[PDB]
Design a protein around this ligand. Structure first.
Ligand SMILES: [Cl-]
Ligand SMILES: [Cl-]
Ligand SMILES: [Zn+2]
Ligand SMILES: [Zn+2]
Ligand SMILES: [Zn+2]
Ligand SMILES: [Zn+2]
Lengths: 409, 409
């Protein structure tokens, strides 16, 4: 196969002159992935592949691995240019980069480690060869993550399954509370996992059902060996996800409470809901104003965190959301100004989660509300349901508990 | 175990304030090797380990992997400092690097890819945190390559075996030529390999016996399936190496000719010998003048290449030599201003090969003369024999052929 058409199509949406892919052994996994180099290909020497906007790619390779490079590129219609000495390497590099505004796997300030792969010394060498500009390839790399129509349809089937499963899970808890019968996190988790598997889907890791203080630990997963029994007066948080094999996940988080919650929990909910709405509103309003192309992931985190307010933001020690793909935590832009300042631009055809929360462990509780957003070319759209209130579990009939949680009363 | 004493001992021989080890997943293999982190340890997040000249190491790690970091460091007597947000990371980094002259796995201009592992963006971040100087850790890394007395003794046993084996190999060729009996490269190779194995040693890759034009290909290895039969009027080159398991290799190259060589071959020999002597003489004279500590690997390549002269240097399209270790091509300084400009300093207790050659394939021939040099604290010393003339094979008695090759007539 040839990787060059896809790389040039990605470049066409930029104003850059080309993409300079550099690798040495395991340094830059993106190099081998974008170029379609098989894992079984043994490459011990450094190489560059220059891909201009239009025209032939240029492969700068050490002459000792010319045979492997002929095989790699036999369908590429590229120039293959061997080098031996550092003088030959530098002359070839000057030939390709001088006066060029180019991208490399580089992240300013090392903000995004998964993209920041080219070593400092090699970047110095590229600049010394006369490159006019070195920009991050992070946005180019996102072009490869665009969903197909079948990907979107599969995501929506997973979303619908999750909406059903979260209702059945919360109804189970509701029924147990009303009946005074014990229920554990693991039992609820397994109800959900059984539904995912029966639908031909898979979760990867077992889903998160958290009661009480466990909901304050984002890194909680109940198991058969260790899981909590629910008691009245404790919160519930369920973060569940599923995909059809090889298709994008859906991934949502819904909350409830065992009985009537107090004012503090309710206030925290309003703050988390306000955070979610602020992120969604900034995404919508920026798209209306200017389309996609300037809005960056970190800005939605800022919107959510600001809107959450001074009482509950100190207990929101997490990013606002993540790229959502065939990997649940996808390789594209995340909604993060917390762990990283993610300056990647939100890209049409990708999807992100919006999942602010607040986690006061000191009883202690955790709230998170997670929806998925597909960055459709005609505008961002939420693909999973919006919770308006925590489910108040064990009081009344389930249909009405659900309706209140949906704001349908 | 704890890696910190060895790192501080290495730092003591420098004027730097400390060594800042950075890694993210597979980016910097040196990080995990120097720190003694087992391959079975799953670390998904970036980390820094600050090792000052004296005092506690400081580990900056993501809080999500604190458990793994407790286990890694349980014998280190280090400070463990978690971070979550980028603001926390940057405050911690400023605390450790501000005003410090430090080393990282960084190679200016990307001259030495095996050392140049920290990404450009992370280096920007370290400088932005106030580091006073970022220097390459390349020389620090060489401190870990110093031979023990048992390593040196094992190297010398391998050297002695190679001196015997190369005599027996060339005597075999001599005898076959005198008798008019065919001899192949593979037959000679297998004589040598049998001797290596009988001595309890191992070669890794089968050794190089090259006849005629094959000696012009540095990347030639005969095999049972494909090997040449010697004819009168062709050169011979034998590059052979061996180690005791887990001990440093010896690695040498000796040349001969089937019958009396012409003036061109003899002139090439004088140039290669002059190149070898010039590298050895610069090493010796610099040590006498100033000891080790300033002389860099590339300078011996320049000496050899300059001395080879304008007729034969154009056919010397290779580095002058390599670090010699438990890996035949060791991780330390190489004698190279050809493929790379290796600015690493020649380090007492390591060994290098000096192996200039010239390879005019157009009959065509190749000459290389390789000796091993141990960088003893009291001065550099050659540990294998110095060839003074190519063996003139098939003429006279072997003892005299050998004596002429040794300059012993
Ligand atoms: Cl290389
Ligand atoms: Cl990380
Ligand atoms: Zn999520
Ligand atoms: Zn989720
Ligand atoms: Zn060698
Ligand atoms: Zn050799």
């Amino acid at each position: 196969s040839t990787p060059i058409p896809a790389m040039q199509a990605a470049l066409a949406a930029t104003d850059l002159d080309g993409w300079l892919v550099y690798d040495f052994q395991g340094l830059n996994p993106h190099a081998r992935r974008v170029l379609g180099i098989g894992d079984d290909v043994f490459l011990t020497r450094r190489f560059f592949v220059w891909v201009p906007r239009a025209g032939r790619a240029v492969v700068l390779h050490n002459h000792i691995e010319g045979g492997n490079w002929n095989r790699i590129t036999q369908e590429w219609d590229a120039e293959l240019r061997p080098f031996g000495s550092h003088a030959e390497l530098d002359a070839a590099l000057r030939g390709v980069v001088s006066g060029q505004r180019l991208a490399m796997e580089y992240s300013p300030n090392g903000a995004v480690p998964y993209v920041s792969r080219v070593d400092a010394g090699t970047l110095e060498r590229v600049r010394g060869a006369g490159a006019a500009e070195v920009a991050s390839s992070a946005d180019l790399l996102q072009a490869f993550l665009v969903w197909t129509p079948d990907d979107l349809a599969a995501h929506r089937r997973a979303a619908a399954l999750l909406m059903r499963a979260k209702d059945d899970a919360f109804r189970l808890i509701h029924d147990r509370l009303r009946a005074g019968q014990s229920v554990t996190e693991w039992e609820v988790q397994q109800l959900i996992m059984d539904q995912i598997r029966a639908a031909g889907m898979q979760a990867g890791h077992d889903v998160n059902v958290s009661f009480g203080v466990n909901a304050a630990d984002s890194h909680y997963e109940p198991s058969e060996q260790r899981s909590a029994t629910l008691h009245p007066g404790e919160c519930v948080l369920i973060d569940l996800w599923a995909q059809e094999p090889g298709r994008p996940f859906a991934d949502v988080t819904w909350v409830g409470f065992a009985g009537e919650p107090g004012t503090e929990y309710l206030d925290a909910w309003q703050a988390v809901r306000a955070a979610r709405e602020a992120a969604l509103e900034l995404l919508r309003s920026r798209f209306v104003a200017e389309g996609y192309g300037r809005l960056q992931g970190w800005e939605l985190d800022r919107a959510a965190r600001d809107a959450m307010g001074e009482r509950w933001a100190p207990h929101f020690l997490h990013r606002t959301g993540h790229d959502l793909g065939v990997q649940i935590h996808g390789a594209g832009a995340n909604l993060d100004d917390y762990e990283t300042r993610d300056t990647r631009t939100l890209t049409p055809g990708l999807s992100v989660t919006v999942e602010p929360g607040t986690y006061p462990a000191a009883g202690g509780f955790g709230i998170r509300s997670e929806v998925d957003v597909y960055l459709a070319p005609d505008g961002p759209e939420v693909t999973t349901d919006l919770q308006q209130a925590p489910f108040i579990l064990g009081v009344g009939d389930w249909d009405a508990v659900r309706a209140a949680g949906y704001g349908e009363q």
